[PDB]
Amino acid sequence: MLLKSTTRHVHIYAGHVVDGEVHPDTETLTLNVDPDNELEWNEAALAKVEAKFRELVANAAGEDLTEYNLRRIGSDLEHFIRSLLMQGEIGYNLNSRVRNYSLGIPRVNH
Amino acid sequence: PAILNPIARPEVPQELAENIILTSLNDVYDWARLSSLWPLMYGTACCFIEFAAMIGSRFDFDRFGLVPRNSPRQADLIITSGTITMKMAPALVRLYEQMPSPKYVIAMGACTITGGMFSSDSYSAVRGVDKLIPVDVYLPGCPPRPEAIMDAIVKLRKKIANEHINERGNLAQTHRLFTAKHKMKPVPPILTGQYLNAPSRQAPPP
Amino acid sequence: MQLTYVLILAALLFCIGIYGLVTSRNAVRVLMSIELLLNAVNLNLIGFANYLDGQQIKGQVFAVFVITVAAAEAAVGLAIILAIYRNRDTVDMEKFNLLK
Amino acid sequence: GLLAGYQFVKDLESAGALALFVPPEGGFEGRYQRRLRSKGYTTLPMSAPGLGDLAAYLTQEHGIRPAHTGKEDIRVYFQPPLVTYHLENLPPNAKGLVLWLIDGKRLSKQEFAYLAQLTQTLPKFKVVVEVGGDRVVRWEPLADWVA
Amino acid sequence: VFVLSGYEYFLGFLIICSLVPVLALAASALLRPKSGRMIRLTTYESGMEPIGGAWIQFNVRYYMFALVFVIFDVETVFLYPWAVAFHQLGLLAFIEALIFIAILVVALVYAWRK
Amino acid sequence: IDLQGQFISALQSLGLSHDLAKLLWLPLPMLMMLIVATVGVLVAVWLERKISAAVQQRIGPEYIGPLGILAPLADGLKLIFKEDVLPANSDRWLFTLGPAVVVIPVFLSYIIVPFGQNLLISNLAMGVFLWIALSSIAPIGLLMAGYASNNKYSLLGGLRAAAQSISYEIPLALAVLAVAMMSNGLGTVEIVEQQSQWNVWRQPIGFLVFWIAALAECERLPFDLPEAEEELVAGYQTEYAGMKFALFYLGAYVNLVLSALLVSVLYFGGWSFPIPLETINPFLQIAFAVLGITMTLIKAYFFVFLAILLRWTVPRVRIDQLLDLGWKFLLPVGLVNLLLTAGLKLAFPVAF
Amino acid sequence: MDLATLTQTITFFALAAAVIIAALGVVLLDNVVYSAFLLGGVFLSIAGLYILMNADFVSAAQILIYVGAVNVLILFAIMLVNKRETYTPVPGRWLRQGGAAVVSLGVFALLTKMILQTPWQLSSVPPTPDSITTIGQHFFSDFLLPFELASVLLLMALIGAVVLARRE
């Protein structure tokens, strides 16, 4: 059965989405960055997140398949997203939905 | 690096409607989903006991139409009631996401919007449910007066009315998804039955 | 609406029930076809009762006894199938060949 | 009433600052907010019990000092103004930036007068305040209801 | 020939009652969010995910009652015209039907003692 | 006033093919009974919702409308507006067809409830027996909802819904056989025109039998095991979210209303302010029609009231304490009542 | 040439098409649960066909016993014996079908050759509506032995199934 790490705007599983199911395979490691649209994504920053994920699974993982490890990966991605969202690549969506600043309020960098 | 955590400056703004026959029907739509919010009995700590006292007869919440419901699928609201440890959190995302789309959230307590007292020197608490699901209304206070929950529901009801019917595009999920082969040596599940049928309980060793 | 096509429809259920009676792989799927056959005969009887012998219906009573006995016999059949499922642990009717 | 048009929007565009006397159920006021969003206005409610001088959070740039809990010694964030930032993050075809305040009872006369005077200056900006009360949703200019 | 008089409402009402579900349910898809198909399709096992294997450990605890129900439910169909004709019949058909009922009661006692 | 006659004649005066005229009067009562059925559902929901608050020193909805009058309106409109979800391995045909199967026959059984003489749809010579028949179709829909769901949690509690519904139909049948003795047949008009000055006094036992077997149609907290919220969450319903759950909800309450109306017509009568009515003329017919309708609704309301009032007085029973009512208290007693009524009609054929 | 006889005709052909289609669904579909529900559909359609033929009691009884009780019993017995239906094919899986088909088809034609050749006795008299009092009279005038003897039939069937499915 699945072994997942469901934070906000990072959901990681251990199967292969065929049409909307997941089908745990033990080796596919899907990802679902920001489903709820807390952030407005570009084509570049999202690729940076993708590459971080790829070089964070393969480059440093050779131990068991616990939820501990996937949760650690999700934490590293959710900190990388802070970095992208502070530096100013991506930003909040502003839409008339919730607008809760889960990551941070806007600063000015004095 | 000039305005950190910025706003995105959208375009193609919203293309709202203006005719009266549709906006009155929108008012009926919102009033209907409004005045019959059906919560989910989700209890983890004393916030649930105040929610239970809210069920009671000193002051119910059956009026303005709330039925405490037991399953997520029939439900419309998670009044998040208690602390969210790091071992029950997926058992909350799997209750939230496993629910129909026009659904709302209330975060009662301080142990579930910043971790409260357990926001420091704790190693198993989630310091805010707003980093698990999109909280829609916040009310503070470890155990709050359960009539304050009805203030939060007043404040949530005047936000359901703030919605529009040609605006349900901000209600689905985009699923920006990927795949990655790996090598992490799967282990067997050590979480089964076998509490008394295990050989070691019926076996004083040598 | 005529007697002729009622008889033909019943005969067609009879044919289909035979097809399901010979084609069956399972063992619970045979009683279903048998019940179809019994339904067909009931249908013939009711047709005869309406058209041929009306002022004293006499085939409707016989159909009552038919549905009675068919229910009882289906009960007993499923009881037997529950028991063979205990030993062989299947209902693949082509595994019940104890002769060569 | 049971059905209302867009005269609320005209009253708001005329006066600049209204004061809703909705009931204490919060079920029959968000529709007028919708009628505003149905025109081009964009909203931001930010719950006055939590606003300070109302010249530092709206006009000027102020310093928010988050919660340290023994860890992470005192630090500022300097969030920008609420009225010169959302007003610049509008879409292109934006008529204005209305301002909603849920709990207005807790505020005082002085900042009511300030918010009223702030409608004329800083043009594309309007105000509404939900001062709870009457059993029928009626409104009044916010220059009135004071002095 | 059709002597039942009292139908021609059963038909149309079977139609309209088979048409309320399909129509109240078709008046939902016209106005509702669409599918949300990734993880909202999973099966409710109280927050946690299902274990696996997923069998039931079947039992006769619900079969045998259906069996005896089939018996005693076939039986009642022999009693409605008895009750309805009890005006016309009188005696020697009550004596002749309490035999039926007594043998039924013997079956009931058999199922009861087990 | 024979409204059928004037409707057909006035419509036959401008032509329209008199057979076609007799054809075009069909849908009017056929939808009027749907109107009063839906209204009875709304009333039953509001009644339970306020009386379950009176029992507890509580106050039900008063902010929806004046007094919660518009609460089930909100519920229904919402459940229209909600998303529907079809879980992973569940079947597509059976899932959205279970609730239809369990809901339809309860509506279809409204072709026998009188509300007044010649103020019903098509008095069938079979009548109540057709209700006993159509009520046995619900377990198929329940098992459909159980099988058409990967939720073992559901199927484990959908089989016990086809264990009580398949258990409280035999005494439900015997208690109405005991009425078929008296009334020369099975039609409701004949069950009730036998009362001209009531069967409860002569069926003091079958009343309890019918009324316990009707409450226990997967309805009320004395049993309602397949929706045992505390034992196992909503049983077979927990995967039904939008309008399908509304179909189940509707079905429960409308079946309760049908049970109340049917106890009224069987044992008390949808007429008959208890004096021998018709001892005291269109303007008088329109008066006694209203009087009979009103008294019918009085008795139906009293039974709805008692039914909902057991829900908050009577903790549930596991499954063995339940099925030891059927075949051990309702079925032997129903047989005894049947034999008693038979013997008494044989000895004392007068009064029956 | 009428509206009242036209509804009977249309209803009859609709019910007959439903019967045939649902029986073919019972017999041809690989999954058996669908077959059981379609069998219930067959039973309902046949109960609706009987009403056209002036049999209402037996129709309600078919709806009360077969679909009500027997079909539920089959829906229990089927999940009693579901194990993912892991059946490997045989080489002659087609052969048997073909044989059955032609055999079955022949019978139909043969029966049809009878049904259209023999001069039935239509007996033009209006039937009787009271098809329930008459059956009561026949259970105690003509067909009394089957009543009294189906009693012990049901007893014996209960005694049999109770001691053939018992778990021991």
Ligand code: SF4
């Ligand atoms: S916030 Fe207070 S009431 Fe809520 S769980 Fe924490 S300590 Fe308990």
